[PDB]
Nucleic acid binder design. Structure first.
Ligand SMILES: [Mg+2]
Length: 1066
RNA sequence: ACCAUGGCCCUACUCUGCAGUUGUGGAAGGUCCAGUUUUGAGGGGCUAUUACAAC
């Protein structure tokens, strides 16, 4: 088999990027090893998989971690592993429905093996390669299988293009219509991934384009673009063509995600303002989903460093941004937000026998939660001596990741975590200090074991934060804070009175809290209607609901299995069915513990580590009908005391699953579990129907839920045990009184005006502003498709893009239009039971309608949230610098704005910490829209070693960007200098040429040695050549002193020049 | 081939994340209903999701 001509003609590019591909792979493998405490197919992580089904797995938690993370960092592995399952079923005449570690291992073994081969050929002037001999083992076992896998991978990757970029059949037909001939692979197609490569046996190998594709699976998008742009793989499509962009996008769509090295930026009032403006230029994710491909394309921007960026929000950061704004601004004197500052780890037992009978370290974690301004808390968290707060306890370095560490001397320690706000369950928790300028409230640690935490004063809905921000903007943060504190103190006075039994229908109004903001139980208690929930009703209902769900799951599973055995089940298309044992094992572990009876305050039920083991054990269980492996699996549940004689709290029905025979694998186990669950619940239903009393493990009659509430008992729980739950519409009356006094707001009906409405009226009427233009763009919703009722000739339902006015009117007419929809839709089901159809449609319309309504409500919240960020950011920056900005308006903000605030030029300075050092990058003048550049530079692996060479931690942004682009241009020229050096050595010393013919591997290190021994170079020169060459392969800079360098932005250029001169030879 | 019918809760803001139990709590949050809302406003039902304690 011959090396493809594309490879031979672009050898310096294939050489460079093959090395980058292999290094990136090793990086991921190394990361996974470290985090999990475990010839790339011999890596510890890959060995683990290889051995993972050699008998009953002793480290299921590790196996499952490796399988999950490999699919995160290598997204193409989901597609290829699915193809490898289907392949094996073929080969061994099996019907395995689920992907396992053998699939993952085999895909990656082959990918790595072929990558390594091409890396070696392209990085050597002359070597012998036995592996290219036609009909050899390498070709038959590894390379030829991989070419077919890659070709099948690309079928699915092109399907993914439709989802990810909105491409239509017409857009992709120049590839999809021409890949296969009539079905063969069309090796004559210009983007064919397979070719004969002059193989006399006439078997399909990877083509040059195919080799490029394999490499690009292991590159970052930036390098995919640099690499492919050098290659003549675009037939006659030109640089600006859509076809070129489609090709390149197809080669990056599922490529490697590299683990990020942690960065910590210094925040300020200015930085927060700029983080806010860069938030509002991006598309909210809920909106992005609804937009046409053209308008989605408008958020795909080219940066200053000529890199395409998706300007889309990955999460709603409104609330954290607002908290940073308040903290860095020092705007609240008394209120402090709930922060986490790491976790305490203490070793309970070094050798704990677990429910699978394997010994493991038992480490307990407690969060270090507290209250203060993020900067002040962070200054307290890490002392100079590297201890936490005033605790004495060591904070372990972030790079040290031995979580399995069994040495008692190493414990306790605190995990190093930058102070962040705790923002879970759409809440903000806060602590109210009596005095101003209080110090951060860090938790005390007792017995090196207990973290003594503090119940928050009170908790606010994140949906209340827009009105708080708006109130802050109109009145001032101090007035805002006084109002939160006053509301809090009213609830406290109420709950104190409850505890004295001094709250009546006659005096409830005196407490100053509206009925709609009192708990129903207080309202029940003063009305004389206090009652518990009816436990028997709840049991009867729960049993019925669960029986129904059990049957739903039985059916879905039988359906999916049949679907998975079908030819029509196509990955990347919409009705694609997959059975994940991970997903099965999640269901089973939750349910097994749900049905485990509690005793002794719940101290008998499965604990955290054993839970993780049980769940993982299930996920990977697959006896080969090996008797021991079956016994081992059953034994786990015996040791958890769920089945077995002499158990006192057994699971009610799990033991039936193991009666007669042990299930052979996770899939058998899930099926049998669900059948047994169905029989248990049917029995219960039948006993309920006879009027008998039944009990289920997870309903407990002694819980307060079921009893009548008392005033005094409930008073104490509300005062002492929980945070105060702050009401919605706290700030409304004050907001409305203010706005009523403004003459521009004169013609507003304030009796039908919520705060969402009034923010928008404020922007329009007081400020002559409006929301960003992309909130007027037409949107698509399935539900509105159904209501519009428009089909193509073939008879599919059309995807409309409507305006808000259109949808207003469809919604008014939804009853009629739903009637039409159902009539047509039912016919189309029948053409492909009356009750079953009506049910199928019922669910279709409900789900769709609910999706549409929620989406529209949330986008309307994003609008006014953006108004508030814009307003606050603009206020910060107005009062900074010699900056004038009364003219700027939210309506001008756009993802690549050429006007308004984002186009303004100001000096900037970005300070951050990475790997224990602290650096600053400055600009003398920079458009606000480019502030994101700094994170891109700080994130770059080279930033550290580069700044070691500059000899300054402070550097110009423009200089570093130029340096990084010049580095990127030098890297292939390094490859060429090596090539010409090797070539000289071969021409001068025929020893080397002979060593090729005698089938020995000649490498660079060897050639340096020959050059040294014949005094073509000396040790100094040898060492430099070696070190520079290594630095470029690492995609990094060499250590200081190796070579004399110039200043930025010519460091890489100067290193390239030195290499070139040290490679001349006598 | 085309066409048609994550275990979960990360393109700097911390995935080195989240994913055991028991208790407490539904004024909040989630979810469902509909002559409800393009004004996270209101109504009705259901529900421990944030937190803390103990293990
Ligand atoms: Mg309300």
């Amino acid at each position: 088999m011959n090396i493809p001509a594309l490879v031979e003609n672009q050898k310096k590019y294939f050489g460079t990027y093959s090395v980058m591909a292999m290094l990136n792979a090793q990086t991921v493998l190394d990361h996974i090893q470290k985090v999990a405490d475990i010839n790339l197919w011999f890596h510890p992580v890959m060995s683990h998989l290889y051995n993972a089904k050699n008998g009953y797995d002793k480290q299921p938690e590790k196996t499952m971690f490796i399988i999950e993370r490999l699919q995160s960092y290598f997204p193409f592995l989901k597609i290829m592993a699915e193809n490898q399952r289907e392949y094996s079923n073929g080969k061994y005449k099996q019907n395995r429905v689920e992907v396992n570690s053998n699939d993952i291992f085999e895909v990656l073994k082959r990918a790595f093996g072929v990558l390594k081969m091409y890396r070696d050929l392209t990085n050597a002037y002359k070597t012998y390669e036995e592996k290219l001999n036609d009909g050899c083992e390498f070709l038959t076992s590894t390379e030829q299988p991989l070419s077919g896998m890659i070709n099948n991978y690309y079928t699915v990757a092109l399907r993914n293009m439709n989802e990810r970029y909105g491409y239509k059949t017409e857009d992709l037909a120049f590839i999809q219509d021409k890949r296969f001939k009539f079905s063969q692979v069309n090796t004559g197609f210009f983007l064919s991934l397979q070719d004969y490569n002059g193989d006399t046996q006439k078997k399909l190998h990877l083509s040059g384009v195919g080799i490029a594709l394999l490499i690009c699976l292991f590159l970052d998008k930036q390098y995919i673009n640099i690499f492919l742009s050098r290659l003549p793989i675009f037939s006659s499509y030109n640089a600006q063509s859509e076809e070129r962009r489609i090709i390149i996008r197809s080669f990056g769509i599922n490529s490697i995600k590299l683990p990020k090295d942690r960065i910590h930026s210094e925040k300020s009032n200015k930085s927060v303002a700029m983080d806010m403006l860069n938030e509002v230029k991006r598309c909210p994710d809920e909106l992005f989903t609804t937009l046409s491909a053209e308008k989605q394309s408008r958020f795909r921007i080219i940066s200053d460093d000529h890199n395409e960026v998706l300007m889309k929000r990955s999460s709603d950061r409104f609330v954290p941004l607002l908290l940073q704004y308040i903290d860095y601004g020092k705007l609240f004197d008394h209120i402090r937000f709930h922060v986490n500052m790491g976790k305490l780890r203490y070793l309970l037992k070094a050798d704990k026998t677990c429910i699978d009978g394997q010994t493991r370290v038992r480490v307990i974690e407690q969060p270090l939660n507290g209250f203060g301004r993020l900067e002040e808390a962070e200054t307290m968290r890490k002392q100079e001596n590297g201890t936490f707060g005033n605790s004495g306890i060591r904070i372990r370095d972030f790079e040290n990741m031995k979580r399995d560490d069994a040495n008692p001397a190493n414990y306790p320690y605190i995990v190093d975590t930058y102070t962040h706000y705790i923002l879970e369950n759409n809440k903000v928790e806060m602590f109210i200090n009596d005095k101003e300028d209080s110090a951060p409230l860090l938790p005390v640690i007792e017995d090196d074991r207990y973290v003594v935490k503090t119940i928050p004063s009170c908790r606010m809905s994140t949906l209340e934060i827009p009105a708080m921000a708006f109130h802050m903007f109109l009145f001032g943060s101090k007035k805002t804070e006084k109002l939160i504190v006053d509301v809090h103190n009213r609830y406290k006075r109420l709950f104190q009175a409850m505890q004295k039994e001094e709250v009546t229908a006659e005096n409830i109004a005196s407490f100053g809290i509206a009925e709609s903001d009192l708990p129903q139980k207080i309202l029940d208690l003063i009305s004389g209607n206090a009652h518990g929930k009816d436990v028997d009703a709840f049991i009867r209902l729960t049993v019925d609901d669960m029986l129904t769900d059990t049957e739903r799951r039985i059916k879905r599973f039988k359906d999916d299995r049949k679907s998975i055995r079908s030819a029509d089940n196509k990955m990347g298309k919409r009705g694609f069915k997959q059975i994940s044992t991970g997903k099965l094992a999640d269901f089973l572990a939750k349910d097994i513990v749900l049905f485990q009876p509690s005793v002794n305050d719940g101290e008998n039920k499965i604990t955290g580590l054993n839970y993780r083991i049980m769940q993982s054990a299930i996920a990977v269980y697959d006896s080969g009908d090996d008797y021991e492996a079956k016994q081992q699996f059953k034994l786990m549940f015996e040791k958890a005391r769920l089945i077995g004689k002499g158990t006192t709290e057994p699971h009610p029905f799990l033991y039936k699953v193991f009666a007669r025979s042990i299930p052979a694998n996770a899939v058998e186990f899930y099926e049998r579990y669900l059948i047994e669950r169905k029989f248990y619940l049917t029995g219960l239903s039948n006993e309920i129907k006879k009027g008998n009393r039944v009990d289920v493990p997870f309903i407990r009659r002694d819980q307060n839920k079921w009893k009548t509430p008392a005033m005094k008992t409930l008073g104490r729980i509300y005062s002492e045990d929980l945070p105060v739950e702050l009401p919605r519409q706290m700030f409304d009356n004050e907001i409305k009184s203010h706005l009523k006094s403004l003459p521009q707001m004169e013609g507003i009906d304030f009796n039908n005006a919520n705060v969402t409405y009034l923010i928008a009226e404020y922007m329009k009427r007081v400020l002559d502003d409006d929301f960003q233009t992309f909130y007027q763009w037409n949107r698509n919703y399935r539900y509105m498709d159904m209501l519009k009722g428009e089909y193509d000739r073939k008879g599919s339902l059309q995807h409309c893009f409507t305006s808000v006015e259109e949808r207003e009117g469809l919604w008014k007419e939804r009853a009629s239009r739903t009637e039409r929809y159902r009539k047509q839709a039912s016919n189309k089901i029948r053409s492909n039971s009356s009750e079953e159809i009506e049910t199928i449609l019922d669910k279709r319309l409900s789900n769709s309608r609910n999706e549409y309504q929620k989406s529209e409500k949330v986008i309307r919240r994003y609008r006014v949230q953006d108004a508030l960020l814009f307003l606050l950011a603009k206020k910060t920056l107005t009062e900074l610098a010699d900056f004038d900005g009364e003219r700027f308006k939210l309506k001008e903000i756009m993802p690549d704005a050429e006007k308004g605030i984002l186009s303004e030029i100001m000096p900037m300075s970005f300070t951050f910490e990475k790997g224990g050092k602290k650096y600053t990058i400055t600009s003398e003048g920079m458009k606000l829209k480019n502030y994101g550049d700094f994170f891109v530079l700080a994130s770059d692996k080279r930033i550290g070693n580069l700044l070691e060479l500059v000899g300054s931690d402070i550097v110009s942004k423009e200089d570093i960007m130029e340096e990084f682009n010049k580095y990127d241009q030098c890297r292939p020229e390094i490859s060429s200098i090596v090539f010409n050096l090797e070539k000289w050595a071969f021409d001068t010393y025929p020893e080397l040429s002979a060593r090729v013919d005698r089938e020995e591997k000649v490498d660079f290190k060897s050639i340096l040695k020959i050059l040294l021994n014949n005094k073509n170079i000396n040790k100094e020169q040898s060492d430099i050549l070696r070190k520079i060459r290594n630095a470029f392969d690492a995609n990094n800079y060499p250590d200081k002193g190796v070579v004399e360098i110039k200043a930025l932005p010519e460091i890489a250029m100067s290193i390239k020049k030195a290499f070139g001169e040290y490679a001349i030879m006598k």
